[PDB]
Amino acid sequence: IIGGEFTTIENQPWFAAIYRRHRGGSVTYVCGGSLISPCWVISATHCFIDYPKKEDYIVYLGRSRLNSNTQGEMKFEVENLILHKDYSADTLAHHNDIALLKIRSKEGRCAQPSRTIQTISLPSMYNDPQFGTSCEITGFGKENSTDYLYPEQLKMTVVKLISHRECQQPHYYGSEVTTKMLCAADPQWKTDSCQGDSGGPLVCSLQGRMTLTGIVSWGRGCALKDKPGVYTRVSHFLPWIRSHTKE
Numbered sequence: 001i002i003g004g005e006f007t008t009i010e011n012q013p014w015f016a017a018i019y020r021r022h023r024g025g026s027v028t029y030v031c032g033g034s035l036i037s038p039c040w041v042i043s044a045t046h047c048f049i050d051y052p053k054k055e056d057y058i059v060y061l062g063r064s065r066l067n068s069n070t071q072g073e074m075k076f077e078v079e080n081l082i083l084h085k086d087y088s089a090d091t092l093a094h095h096n097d098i099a100l101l102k103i104r105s106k107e108g109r110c111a112q113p114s115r116t117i118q119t120i121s122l123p124s125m126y127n128d129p130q131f132g133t134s135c136e137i138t139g140f141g142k143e144n145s146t147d148y149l150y151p152e153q154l155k156m157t158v159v160k161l162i163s164h165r166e167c168q169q170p171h172y173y174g175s176e177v178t179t180k181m182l183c184a185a186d187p188q189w190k191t192d193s194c195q196g197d198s199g200g201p202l203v204c205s206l207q208g209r210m211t212l213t214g215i216v217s218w219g220r221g222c223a224l225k226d227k228p229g230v231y232t233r234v235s236h237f238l239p240w241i242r243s244h245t246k247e
């Protein structure tokens with residue numbers, strides 16, 4: 001997160017931190033995610049496409065720091081890693097960048113709700129907030145494009161939803177952005193998500209209810225003028241989500 005401010009997991013209870021195990025014992029951060037149900041975390045396919053082995057991932061819930069423990073946190077293994085079959089990456093655009101992770105603890109249980117562990121709601125069929133609406137993003141990603149390390153404390157920021165017409169302008173993304181993607185940026189171009197924030201939640205208040213409207217996917221640079229962040233439009237994926245979460 002470029003700009004914005006530090007926050008705690010108490011203010012973002014649906015946030016999931018996803019790491020990958022390496023040969024030796026080293027564990028690095030991969031992407032963020034969101035708990036949409038006790039046993040399910042939703043993220044982005046591009047995070048796991050190069051290493052589709054469910055046994056290498058560790059999912060954390062109730063975590064505020066990158067490399068230390070938080071009272072109340074819970075560790076989970078990945079029971080099932082579901083990637084979207086139509087995922088593809090062009091010059092800039094990442095299509096169908098959505099994924100589901102089924103979680104289970106060592107005792108074979110799913111998540112137990114608490115002050116630091118809650119689920120986030122899904123949108124209704126093709127029901128998105130009006131453009132120009134303020135939404136929040138959360139993540140452990142870069143604070144500046146020049147950084148190579150990630151901040152130790154979780155961060156958050158607020159950005160405005162941009163319309164498809166505007167995002168499709170020549171100086172923006174042109175025809176590279178589709179109807180299955182959402183553009184969001186700061187009107188002043190000071191704050192934005194960046195590398196390390198992928199898979200995380202784009203949360204908007206829709207009719208008094210916090211809703212998972214987007215998933216951090218891509219963008220040209222970070223916080224560059226006329227180059228908004230692009231998010232996977234969750235509302236256009238409800239059928240795919242429901243079919244893979246049954247049994």
Ligand SMILES: *[C@@H](O)[C@H](CCCN=C(N)N)NC(=O)[C@H](C)NC(=O)[C@@H](CO)NS(=O)(=O)CCc1ccccc1
Nearest residue numbers: 092145192193194195196198217218219220221222229
């Ligand atoms: C998470 O993996 C990350 C989130 C990007 C968020 N960006 C915003 N502007 N909000 N996504 C990626 O890194 C994806 C996989 N790739 C890209 O975003 C690539 C291709 O679109 N974009 S880039 O312009 O080649 C990223 C590299 C870069 C270049 C210059 C300065 C900063 C970053």
